[PDB]
Design a protein around this ligand. Structure first.
Ligand code: FE
Ligand code: NA
Ligand code: NA
Length: 105
């Protein structure tokens, strides 16, 4: 079965599924009504690269800052507290690294 992180809230870090760069902490994740996992901030300042999303106001496209793999969107001023973003990310673009449990293949 494919990765679906919408309702997933375990302790760990979501990394880029393509290159492994650290993207989002479990700390930053919050429950939302949309089909995609929602986060307020990235782990590193260069975790994501941003580009305009021309056909939607208050929205940017986001990709991995290291390898360029497409991640989803940053919705400006759409987060849980005023002025926070909602990073709405494809689960297929993420791999979850659980605290304590990064076991061998
Ligand atoms: Fe990457
Ligand atoms: Na951060
Ligand atoms: Na936009």
């Amino acid at each position: 079965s494919m990765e679906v992180f919408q309702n997933h809230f375990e302790p760990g870090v979501y990394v880029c599924a393509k290159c492994g760069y650290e993207l989002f902490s479990s700390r930053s994740k919050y429950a939302h009504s949309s089909p995609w996992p929602a986060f307020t901030e990235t782990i590193h300042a260069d975790s994501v690269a941003k580009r305009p999303e021309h056909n939607r106001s208050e929205a940017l496209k986001v990709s991995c800052g290291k390898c360029g793999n497409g991640l989803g969107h940053e919705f400006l001023n759409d987060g849980p507290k005023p002025g926070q973003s909602r990073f709405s990310i494809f689960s297929s673009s993420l791999k979850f690294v659980p605290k304590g449990k990064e076991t061998s293949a």
